[PDB]
Write a protein that binds this DNA or RNA. Structure first.
Ligand SMILES: [Zn+2]
Ligand SMILES: [Zn+2]
Lengths: 120, 281, 730, 57, 65, 57, 69, 108, 192
DNA sequence: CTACCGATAAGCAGATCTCTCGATTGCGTATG
DNA sequence: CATACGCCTCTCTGCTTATCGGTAG
RNA sequence: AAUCGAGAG
């Protein structure tokens, strides 16, 4: 409908797509800034914190499979005043990304001191 | 054993005895292997014993139901249960399909409130036609007579019926349906002889059944766990013997030796009217 | 506190008058605050009342109960607020509403109580009483139960189910059951007042939130669509609901029907739309531990409960033990006081509305906005809630009106006998399984499960009828009585790798669901769930993060072959049992619980630690006993029945009950004139300071067969020693 | 009763002249039978006796 | 939408009724008032198998060891 | 050693005659009321087994 | 509650020894065994009587029914 | 490989919504977004409609304060990765033909 | 209540055979190969299945209980009466056990030599759903001490795990006696 | 044809030593 | 505000009873 | 006098 304290932003920016480019979803926590900067269960170091990179590529594990998902790639049309879907053909079905990733905060429990804990 | 057994014997006199058994002496001129063969010949086998998994393919496009049943290895189950391909064929053609059909029709009535070949042979096709004529809403049938490894029977109903499980009903019908059972007997184990006198003991009591079989069992000396059974098939005095034997037997696991006079007085007081009477109101 | 939340959730009692679609001149009575004044006396300025009072004069140590009942007429037209007393409510000792809450032993000696006296007991009619702590099911935890008594409910009633409790933030609980039917549908069940009602689960599911039916399919059958058992069962459920309720096409209609059905049992006022009373029954029956505004939550909770019920049916999990400590909690006794007070004030509101209805029937005076009329009507009713509660404590029986999810009725208050100090301390640690199981035949409830390690003392249990039914707490067993700061736990669990509850299309035993206080948060895999659990304990035992409370136990259940249903279950509520224990990586005092520890490798002493097996080590093996079980010298050299006999005997020992026997009037007391300290004492004879009540003497014992006058069990005293004051007492 | 479940009623006030005595010259004030120990299997009572004598000495 | 024995609505996500009870070439969504042809649902092929504990036997036990 | 509270002054009781229940004219129940002790069904059955009939009567 | 006049097992008076025992224990670093030795108690029947007296009459007296508190 | 993000975007340009498994929309329908102000978190409310369907939606209440969701693409021939910001919304599509199915407020 | 040095030596050795005793009991019951390491995944899976199945758990408990009872009998025979430092008739405990005045050879044996396997109902010990017998013991542990078999004796005390198991068994005995007191009352009254 | 009856799974009625203490006892409303 | 008079939910045996058909008048 | 609670063998 129309909510109080909400503005319908009628000016968005384009999301191009056309050997060819492939789209991914990446999830990050709110404690990582994204301004500053194929694989499975990778890791990387940022903000002197252990960062886990899990690629929970569901459905697409069994090659292409049926390719039915639970999210859409909403895109701007040639009006840029609303949200629409995009695809590659006349399927009129959502086009899930070519991969997906998740980032999870990681700690490291220090290895227990057997010598100092097994006091006779 | 213990007070449960004691009160079962005296306090209730239950003919629905929890654990009934009968002791079957076997002839001295038999071998142990032949004894085991006869035990497996007598002991009950149910249909579910020889089914690895039964597959149901609910197809609605009328509402077809291909029920393909997988059987265990023939060389294994034939020599474990003494059941043959012909006997299993008869069981499926007579008991199992009819029980399942009755279950399906009853459930619908209450609801309102591997490879093969396209033609085994002409005699097989005539059997299939006989099956379809005999049963109500069956449409196919074939049981492997050369390996005993599968048996399908296509099945349909109308369109007004709702969805049916076709798994729980199949399983329960399969468990109920019997292949080769001596009535009131559900196993015949071979216990290790104690104090001499080799004995074959079952999981039920049916004296009529073994009375026919004298080639192995010393039928003259069958003594059973039950009291009502022995009373109505052998007499009041055999019943009193059984009562004294059972009541002393429970005292005899703990070696609390009670006099053979108290027990016989109890037995003859609870058989004082010619029937198995208890001690209650 | 809780007695403002209780009156807040009571609501308002509406009634109209009989003179003008004009319903009438509305009345809405309610209570918004309950005041418990500390006990005072009217002998002007009210002086302070001390528990030696009402004990010297054979009376009760009762405070005053005054509540600010409202008399609003119509939605803020003329609200006639008025407080009024309701009689002297009994209050215990050493509690905040008693005049010893924060005192010193010196002033306690001065006040004639005792030198180091403790409370816990209400003084009703000159007798000390005590609300026994019963042990009930774990709150907010859906535990799959198999009971052949669930088959008795009728034909097609399979003996499976899913029973869950749910406690309101005023400490009152509503339980739910999800029976499973052989045809395929599952019928939600509940109780109201003192009667039982049953409802199809799908009607409740659509009542809670307005969404598609495909959402139910995805929330029960997450990603096992290639399965067949679940798909067939769910199709049975959905089609059965559709064909049994063909005209419940949307949430408004389903709530309308629910309200029409449940109208007179709830005594709804005429100004209650069906769409409103349906919502009221929905928000005051199902999953009350989630409260209002969490219908979107109860939806996923009930979907998870249905899926777990399906898993229980299909043999993909195991029937959780209800009589094992892993699935138990203890009601605190004062919370029974709170529940009964809340029910009494509810019934008092009902009685004043009944008085107004009698006024309508005969008197016919509708001056609702007349305070003189209010005074006339109010003075007619019985207001002595304090007298009612004093009755309850003095008689033990419970005249309630809705049961409050309590299986028994009588036997809630026991007498805190002061025969011996050991008896006195024993009272305040015992747990009763309930008067229900006392009348029974099956022993399996009386067994000693290993789940009670360090929680219930294996030795301390009275032989006879209550053997196994009255098992005391470990002396280092702490019962949490405050809600923990869980509001920030989701904030860190998400970043750890958990996808939240929404936008999560996944269910089944194959994935770990993270739940705090019985509220689903998200869904994570099993290996990652193990990692998350151990990381949570790692961050929790070191108190760096303010958002992880000490008492938060994190029950993690790994995947198993037809074992227990998995799921990282966190808890921070009240009523739980807790035990301190060490945490081997960077050792520090860590708090564990009965649900939590059944998957933890807690070595008894540090010497039997193994490589990558144990992660916790008990502080001392002696902490699994109670006080009276740690007091037995050299216990590990005795037969366990002998230890139990000793624990039972020491509670029957004639020794000094106290030294304030001058200022007490108990019916019968035994004291030992001369007591001695034990040479062979435990280390905890001084930690608890039991030198104040010597229960015996150090006697020269001769293990000798000399007289013949002691063979079976007798013994012989020395006549001279007896004549020199050996064991004398009055 | 001892603190090990060895309860038992006092059966006679044995006069001290009839009580057994030792070299030190003390009649024990409590006499209990040894046969209570085999079936009941309380070594805790024995070790408490030992520890008590040692501690008082 | 199409899964095993049941078809959900593609628009409103509600369970479409069973095609046999409705007139040919027209199956109606109870919510969307839409129309689907009946020839897009040809074979509702669903496979099932027992629970491997549904049929205890003296011969499965020998297979286990 | 603990001196238990089950002392023999609170356990002994004897009656020769005394109060009787009005509607049955049998001895009252209890010690503090100076009543009788019940010879119950099992004791009666024991007295029958001995054959001591006048004891039973 | 108060120190007994005579030892139970033997009869050796230990009731004129409680204050002496407390003084010996508090004035100097005398262990309990040494104090009981110096106090005339060499048999354990006497030794435990003064080693294990509680003196609860102190806690008993602090509730006087004839004094303002 | 070890591929970084070439360009970071902050303005609303895309969105991600979860209706239910197996859901489709035609060319005609459009989704209209809203963004909340005076509130610290960046809430979104989705509005969509047609003759008999309503792609209504509201964002999370306890998630966006803790985690984030981000869209982007990867270059097949080069290492460049574009990045976009998208908020997750849960869409409960309720048709226009049944919103008003109501009975009596109170049944006499 | 004591032994000699040689008696303690014999007791210790015949007791310390129990590790292999328990592992072999488990390995044989699971029908897996003898002398297999305990950490074998197949052994763990078979033990888990046995835990889930009541009859399988009973079979395993019966077999392991027979083995550890054999070990206990060996210890008792080799130690008492050939090991006690004080011998009959001087050994008064053994004297009243032999003479029937009080107690029994079993009582003397578990005071001086070995307390022995603890029997809960007809089984060893209830096992938690996680497969642990106690918090300390690892899940699905092949070990006599885990399975309720206590190697301690009342003379030198029992470890806390064995103390817990023994408390369980003693409480079970007390409950069984409490039931059996009243079980025969109705039977006898109805007969009589 | 149908009554006489001979036999087929469910609802209910009644079961499951002796003793000593202590504490308390349902409420609503009508006339003076 | 005292005093007085009635209305209100986790066993097992053994006998209440079955729905229907077999089968001679 | 019943009910509830504590215990004894
Ligand atoms: Zn639709
Ligand atoms: Zn002395």
């Amino acid at each position: 409908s129309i909510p109080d304290g909400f503005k319908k932003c009628k000016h968005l920016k384009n999301f191009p797509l056309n050997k060819q480019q492939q789209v991914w979803l990446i999830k990050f926590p709110s404690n990582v800034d994204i301004s500053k900067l194929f694989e499975s269960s990778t890791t990387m170091t940022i903000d002197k914190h252990d960062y886990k990179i899990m690629d929970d590529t569901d459905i697409e594990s069994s090659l292409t499979q049926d390719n039915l998902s639970n999210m859409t790639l909403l895109v701007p049309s040639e009006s840029k005043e609303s949200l629409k879907i995009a695809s590659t053909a006349k399927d009129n079905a959502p086009l899930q990304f070519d991969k997906v990733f998740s980032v999870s905060e990681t700690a490291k429990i220090p290895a227990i001191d057997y010598s100092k804990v097994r006091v006779p | 054993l213990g007070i449960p057994r004691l009160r079962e014997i005296v306090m209730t006199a239950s003919a629905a005895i929890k654990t009934p058994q009968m002791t079957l002496p076997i002839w001295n001129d038999v071998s142990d292997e032949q004894a085991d063969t006869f035990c497996k010949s007598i002991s009950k086998v149910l249909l579910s014993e020889v089914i690895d998994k039964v597959i149901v393919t609910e197809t609605t496009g009328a509402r077809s139901y291909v029920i393909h049943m997988r059987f265990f290895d023939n060389n294994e189950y034939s020599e474990e249960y003494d059941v043959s391909k012909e006997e299993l064929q008869n069981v499926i053609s007579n008991q199992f399909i009819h029980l399942l059909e009755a279950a399906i029709v009853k459930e619908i009535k209450k609801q309102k409130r591997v490879e093969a070949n396209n033609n085994m042979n002409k005699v097989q096709r005539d059997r299939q036609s006989a099956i379809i004529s005999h049963h109500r809403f069956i449409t196919k049938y074939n049981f492997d007579d050369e390996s005993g490894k599968w048996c399908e029977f296509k099945l349909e109903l109308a369109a007004d019926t709702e969805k049916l499980l076709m798994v729980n009903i199949v399983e329960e019908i399969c468990r109920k349906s019997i292949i080769r059972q001596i009535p009131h007997i559900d196993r015949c184990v071979h216990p290790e002889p104690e104090n001499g006198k080799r004995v074959l003991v079952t999981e039920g009591v049916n004296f009529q059944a073994m009375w026919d079989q004298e080639a192995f069992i010393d039928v003259d000396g069958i003594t059973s766990n039950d009291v009502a059974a022995v009373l109505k098939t052998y007499g009041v005095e055999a019943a009193r013997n059984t009562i004294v034997n059972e009541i002393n037997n429970v005292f005899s696991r703990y070696a609390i030796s009670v006099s053979f006079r108290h027990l016989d007085l109890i037995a003859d007081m609870m058989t004082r009217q010619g029937t198995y009477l208890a001690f209650n109101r | 506190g809780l007695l403002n939340l209780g009156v807040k959730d009571i609501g308002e009692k509406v009634i109209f008058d009989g003179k003008p679609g004009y319903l009438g001149n509305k009345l809405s009575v309610s209570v918004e605050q309950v005041s418990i004044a500390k006990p005072m006396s009217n002998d002007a300025v009210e002086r302070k009342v001390y528990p030696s009072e009402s004990r010297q004069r054979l009376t009760s140590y009762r405070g005053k109960l005054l509540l600010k009942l409202k008399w609003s007429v119509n939605n803020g037209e003329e609200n006639l607020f008025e407080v009024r007393d309701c009689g002297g409510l009994p209050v215990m000792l050493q509690s905040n509403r008693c005049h010893l809450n924060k005192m010193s032993p010196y002033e306690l000696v001065q006040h004639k109580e005792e030198s180091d006296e403790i409370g816990g007991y209400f003084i009703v009619n000159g007798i000390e009483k005590l609300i026994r702590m019963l042990i009930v099911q774990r709150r907010n935890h859906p535990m799959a139960i198999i009971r052949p008594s669930f088959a008795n409910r009728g034909a097609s009633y399979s003996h499976y189910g899913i029973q869950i409790r749910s406690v309101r933030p005023d400490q009152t609980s509503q339980t739910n059951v999800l029976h499973y039917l052989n045809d395929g549908q599952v019928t939600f069940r509940f109780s109201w007042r003192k009667n039982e009602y049953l409802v199809p689960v799908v009607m409740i599911l659509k009542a809670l939130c307005h969404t598609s039916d495909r959402e139910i399919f995805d929330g029960i059958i997450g990603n096992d669509v290639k399965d067949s058992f679940l798909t067939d069962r769910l199709e049975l459920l959905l089609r059965g609901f559709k064909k049994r309720y063909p005209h419940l096409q949307n949430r408004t209609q389903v709530l309308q029907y629910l309200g029409d059905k449940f109208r007179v049992v709830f005594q709804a006022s005429p100004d209650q739309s069906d769409l409103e009373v349906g919502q009221e029954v929905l928000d005051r029956i199902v999953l009350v531990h989630l409260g209002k505004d969490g219908s979107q939550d109860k939806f996923r909770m009930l979907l998870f409960m249905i899926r777990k019920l399906y898993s229980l049916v299909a043999g993909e999990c195991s029937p959780d033990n209800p009589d094992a400590t892993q699935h138990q909690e203890v009601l605190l006794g004062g919370f029974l006081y709170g529940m009964i007070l809340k029910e009494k004030i509810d019934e008092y509101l009902q009685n004043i509305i009944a008085q107004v209805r009698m006024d309508i029937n005969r008197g016919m005076a509708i001056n609702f906005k007349d305070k003189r009329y209010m005074s006339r009507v109010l003075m007619r009713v019985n207001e002595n809630i304090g007298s009612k509660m004093q009755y309850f404590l003095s008689t033990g029986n419970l005249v309630s009106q809705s049961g409050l999810d309590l299986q028994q009725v009588s036997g809630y208050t026991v007498v805190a006998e002061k025969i011996n100090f050991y008896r006195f301390i024993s009272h305040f640690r015992m747990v009763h399984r309930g008067s229900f199981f006392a009348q029974l035949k099956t022993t399996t409830v009386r067994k000693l499960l290993p789940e009670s390690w360090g929680f219930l003392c294996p030795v301390h249990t009275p032989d006879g009828s209550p053997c196994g039914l009255l098992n005391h707490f470990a002396h280092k067993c702490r019962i949490s009585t405050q809600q923990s700061d869980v509001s920030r736990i989701p904030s860190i669990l998400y970043s750890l790798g958990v996808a939240p509850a929404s936008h999560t299309f996944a269910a089944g035993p194959s994935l770990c669901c993270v739940q705090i206080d019985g509220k689903i948060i998200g869904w994570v895999s099993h290996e990652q769930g193990k990692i998350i659990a151990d990381t949570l304990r790692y961050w929790k035992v070191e108190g760096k993060t303010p958002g992880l409370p000490i008492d938060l136990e994190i029950g993690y259940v790994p995947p198993s072959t037809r074992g227990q249903y998995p799921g990282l279950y966190l808890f921070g509520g009240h009523s739980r049992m807790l035990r301190p224990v060490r945490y081997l990586p960077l050792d520090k005092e860590d708090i564990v619980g009965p649900f939590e520890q059944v998957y933890m490798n807690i070595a008894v002493t540090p010497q039997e630690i193994q490589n990558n097996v144990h992660t916790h080590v008990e502080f001392t093996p002696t902490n699994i006993l109670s006080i009276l079980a740690n007091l037995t010298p050299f216990s590990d050299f005795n037969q366990s029945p002998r230890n139990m006999y000793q624990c039972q005997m020491g509670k029957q020992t004639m020794g000094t009950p106290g030294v304030a026997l001058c200022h007490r009037s108990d019916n019968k007391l035994y004291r030992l004139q001369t007591g001695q300290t034990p040479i062979v004492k435990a280390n905890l004879y001084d930690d608890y300071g039991m030198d104040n009540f010597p229960n015996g003497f150090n006697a020269v014992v001769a293990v000798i067969s000399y007289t013949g006058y002691d063979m079976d069990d007798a013994m012989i005293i020395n006549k001279s020693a007896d004549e020199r004051g050996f064991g004398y007492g009055t | 009763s001892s603190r090990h479940g060895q309860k038992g009623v006092c059966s006679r006030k044995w006069p001290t002249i009839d009580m057994p005595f030792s070299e030190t010259g003390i009649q024990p004030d409590i006499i209990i039978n040894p046969h209570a120990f085999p079936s009941r299997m309380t070594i805790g009572m024995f070790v408490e006796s030992l520890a008590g004598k040692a501690g008082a000495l | 939408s199409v899964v095993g024995s049941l078809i959900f609505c593609l628009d409103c996500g509600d369970l479409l009724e069973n095609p046999n009870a409705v007139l040919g070439s027209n199956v109606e969504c109870s919510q969307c008032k839409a129309i689907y042809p009946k020839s897009q649902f040809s074979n509702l092929k669903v496979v099932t198998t027992t629970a491997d504990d549904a049929f205890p036997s003296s011969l499965r036990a020998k297979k286990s060891v | 050693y603990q001196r238990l509270r089950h002392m023999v002054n609170d356990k002994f009781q004897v009656r020769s005659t005394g109060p009787v229940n009005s509607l049955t004219m049998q001895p009252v129940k209890g010690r503090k009321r100076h009543g009788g002790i019940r010879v119950g069904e099992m004791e009666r059955d024991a007295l029958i087994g001995h054959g001591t009939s006048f004891l039973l009567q | 509650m108060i120190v007994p006049v005579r030892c139970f097992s033997c009869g050796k008076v230990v009731g004129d020894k409680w204050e002496s025992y407390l003084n010996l224990l508090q004035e100097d670093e005398l262990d309990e065994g040494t104090a009981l030795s110096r106090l005339g108690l060499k048999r354990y029947c006497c030794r435990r009587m003064i080693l294990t007296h509680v003196d609860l009459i102190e806690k008993f007296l602090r509730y006087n029914p004839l004094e303002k508190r | 490989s070890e591929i970084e993000i070439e360009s970071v975007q902050d303005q609303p340009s895309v969105a991600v919504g979860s209706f239910f498994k197996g859901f489709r929309a035609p060319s005609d329908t459009t989704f209209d977004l809203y963004k909340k102000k005076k509130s610290e978190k960046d809430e979104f409310v989705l509005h969509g409609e047609n003759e008999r369907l309503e792609y209504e939606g509201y964002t999370d209440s306890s998630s966006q304060a803790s985690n984030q969701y981000v869209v982007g693409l990867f270059n097949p021939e080069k290492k460049s990765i574009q990045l976009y910001k998208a908020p997750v919304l849960v869409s409960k599509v309720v048709s226009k033909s049944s919103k008003n199915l109501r009975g009596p407020k109170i049944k006499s | 209540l004591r032994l000699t040095a040689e008696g303690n030596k014999w007791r210790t050795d015949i007791l310390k055979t129990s590790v292999d005793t328990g592992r072999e009991a488990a390995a044989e019951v699971t029908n897996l190969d003898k002398d297999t390491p305990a950490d074998d995944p197949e052994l763990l899976k078979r033990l888990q299945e046995i835990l889930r199945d009541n009859n399988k758990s009973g079979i395993l408990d019966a077999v392991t209980s027979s083995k550890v009872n054999a070990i206990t009998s060996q210890v008792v025979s080799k130690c008492v009466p050939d090991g006690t430092m004080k011998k009959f008739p001087c050994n008064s405990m053994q004297a009243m056990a032999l003479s029937g005045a009080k107690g029994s050879n079993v009582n003397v044996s578990q005071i001086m030599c070995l307390l022995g396997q603890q029997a809960l109902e007809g089984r060893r010990v209830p096992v938690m759903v996680s497969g642990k017998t106690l918090p300390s013991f690892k899940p699905y542990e092949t070990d006599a001490m885990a399975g309720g078999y206590v190697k301690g004796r009342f003379y030198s005390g029992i470890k806390p795990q064995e103390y817990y198991f023994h408390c369980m068994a003693g409480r079970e005995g007390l409950i069984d006696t409490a039931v059996k007191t009243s079980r025969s009352g109705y039977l006898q009254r109805c007969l009589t």
